[PDB]
Design a protein around this ligand. Structure first.
Ligand SMILES: O=c1[nH]cc([C@@H]2O[C@H](COP(=O)(O)O)[C@@H](O)[C@H]2O)c(=O)[nH]1
Ligand SMILES: O=c1[nH]cc([C@@H]2O[C@H](COP(=O)(O)O)[C@@H](O)[C@H]2O)c(=O)[nH]1
Ligand SMILES: O=P(O)(O)OC[C@H]1O[C@@H](O)[C@H](O)[C@@H]1O
Ligand SMILES: [Mn+2]
Ligand SMILES: [Mn+2]
Ligand SMILES: [Mn+2]
Lengths: 303, 304, 303
């Protein structure tokens, strides 16, 4: 009615075939055009190569789109950063003003769950920002996942955020958190965060069985699977931390706040590391798409 | 149903899809002194009606939740004053069970308005993150209520007695859409200037109505805060409101005024300190919220 | 469906008879076998003796059980601490791995509410941890009760936690909190917390009337009734505080974190008080079962 679902996604959902939701803010605010389009195409190709149907979610001319046509992807990507970064709380406004919106994890969660997609691949999830006891700056991603029964496939949480506090917040929100094939919770750019994972899963089939259980119980809280970036693609943790500290200070000084903050910080860290962090970001999203697609296929086979 | 009493005019309005504006009752019982509390409530209901909407003041009377009050009930409530229980959402069941009188806060009024399908709720200010919440965790259930109730709250922002930046952050985490009306600055109740940028902006009642309408069609289970800056000619910005507020906060700490006694103490003391100016501003902003809120409700009714 | 409800509980729910939910972690994590089984039997007997059907909740071989048979209670008791401490966010995982789980307050709430049980007797509820300002360590019991319309019967909150902040957090979550026949909020082992109770109820009938109103209103938030430990069983606040202070220091030095912290502290306080604290813990659970049952019976009669 209000939501436009692509034929291919619509067909897969009707037949119980694997579908993987994808967000669009990485396209609009994660990298420049046409690299953004290239990375988005590659991710969707990895999803299809591993047996799932990719469902990139966005809002175009006020219409929520679940699954984008090639034309729509190209159009969105070419708009670049002029597209509105759209969290869940922004959806109604972008719809009402007939605008274009690139959806974050919290908005993408909402639409994916709405149409019955169970697996959502992202790069990293928002979290508790550093010094949140002074700011209370905490991503709506965490509350959204706490009340949306969907599995988010991430590479953990970036060190621009407070990882230990983000893990505590997720526990309080009743989100099941598990690291993939590791006892150590990953830190996005780097495989190791310094925090033990609260739980562990060792295969795509293991992940699918937890999701299946969650669905059967009708629990209204979600799941975060954290897939460590492949060791060969992991960025040096001292280079990342040094760039991160500088970026955080610059954000504070230039009064970058609210939803402008994460995009500002990730872009600055990429500048400061001469491209190394963006390259790792691209690597982990591709790895997440691979594992995420395998989970969705396993889940489809269970059901 | 058998427990909630809906006034005939509100009942008819809901059945026919007419514009309805919910109103809370704690501003009457605990928010303002006895002549102005009743006078203001009557003036607000009149502004709502004059602009084409039906006012639905919500309260609990002798254990009965009432949605829409008669002039007599409004009179009865204003005079009972603070003998009525200040009733947050979490207190409703208790007040009903004990057959008490309760003046409903934003969190309680939200619950009842949403229950019967009212989409627009006009208030003065919303509760928020209290100052020093890092040592207390004192945070209004208004914020959590709005985060899980699909209704639009029309306020004049957040008072500086609270921590405005942290309140804005908390609302974002709860997925509440926040927009300032015809301004880039988030307003601060008595005064238009909070020092904080508005996270979003809307420029007409019709624009507000379109956001609410989209939110309803999407079936999102989170609400909206529209923050209407107090009209420039009624602002208390010129009256040392921030100084008076700071002095009031300090005096409350020294006299151990806490809990439900605090806000009334602070409001009375700030009014003393500003020679009546802060109360006048409070009256002005609630009336302005009623005007814009009614216009939003009417535009929404027309959309639907 | 997926949940196994015992015949006695099922029959009681079908007939609108009083049912009291109970958790299993004190069996699993509170004391050694076979005394642990005898205590569990004594608590269930208090429930039956006061006119209600006890519904002990646990997960056995991946199956959620609401109401345990004699054989099932024996198996749970013999597993001892080898059972997984299962919060709400752990349920899907324990189900998926076919594990045994002792459900905490947050997990037990979910299952009791699912099948229409209105009264859940516990000992104490989890809360805001001390120094939560630097850790954000806050029990999911609080968020669970804020979105589950069920009454929890507790003896308040232990002083190992931050009681004032716990009370504030509950207000924020819209949980109605009332002390039973007292103006002072109780502190688990001890009747006095130092905090005024936010509200008060003076009989099981009063409690049932609040629950009945909450049910008729269809509010989706729960209730915490805090029943002070009987005066003759109350532990002295200075022998508790001494043990408590030492236990807290030790947990900090041994870097005990996450879901291990509360079980560590309670076990250590019990060690340091030579059994006095566990004795008080058993006394308050038995008192809670008595009052809880009377409330559940009064509620059944109202309905
Ligand atoms: O490399 C990236 N990680 C994460 C984001 C986005 O940032 C959001 C968090 O932003 P905020 O907490 O302001 O809502 C996440 O949901 C995600 O969509 C992004 O654009 N690029
Ligand atoms: O003697 C006790 N044993 C176990 C608990 C459990 O601890 C939980 C809180 O721990 P956490 O916040 O870490 O989930 C409670 O739900 C309860 O089931 C308790 O409170 N008291
Ligand atoms: O959760 P509650 O207690 O209702 O919110 C805190 C503040 O919200 C307002 O209504 C009151 O003035 C109170 O001080
Ligand atoms: Mn933020
Ligand atoms: Mn408060
Ligand atoms: Mn914890």
């Amino acid at each position: 009615s209000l939501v436009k679902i692509s034929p291919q996604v619509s067909e897969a959902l009707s037949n119980g075939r694997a579908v993987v939701a994808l967000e669009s803010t990485i396209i609009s605010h994660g990298m420049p055009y046409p690299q953004n389009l290239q990375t988005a195409k590659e991710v969707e190709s990895i999803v299809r190569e591993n047996g799932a149907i990719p469902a990139t979610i966005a809002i175009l001319n006020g219409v929520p789109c679940i699954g984008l046509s090639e034309e729509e992807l190209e159009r969105l990507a070419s708009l670049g950063k002029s597209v509105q970064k759209t969290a869940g709380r922004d959806i109604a406004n972008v719809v009402a003003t007939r605008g274009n919106g690139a959806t974050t994890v919290s908005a993408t969660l909402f639409f994916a769950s709405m149409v019955g997609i169970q697996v959502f691949v992202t790069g990293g999830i928002g979290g508790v920002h550093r010094h949140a006891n002074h700011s209370m700056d905490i991503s709506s991603d965490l509350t959204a996942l706490g009340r949306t029964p969907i599995a988010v496939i991430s590479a953990g949480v970036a060190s621009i955020l407070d990882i230990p506090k983000t893990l505590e917040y997720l526990e309080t929100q009743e989100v099941y958190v598990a690291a993939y094939k590791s006892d150590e919770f990953p830190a996005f750019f780097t495989e190791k965060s310094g925090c033990k994972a609260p739980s562990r899963v060792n295969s795509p089939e293991d992940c699918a069985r937890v999701i299946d259980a969650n669905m059967k119980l009708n629990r209204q809280a979600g799941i975060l699977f954290a897939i460590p970036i492949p060791k060969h693609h992991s960025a040096a943790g001292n280079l990342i931390e040094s760039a991160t500290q500088r970026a955080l200070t610059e954000a504070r000084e230039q009064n970058v706040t609210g939803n402008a903050e994460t995009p500002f910080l990730l872009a600055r860290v990429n500048e400061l590391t001469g491209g190394t962090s963006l390259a790792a970001n691209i690597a982990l999203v591709k790895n997440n798409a691979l594992i995420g697609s395998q989970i969705a296929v396993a889940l489809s086979q269970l059901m």
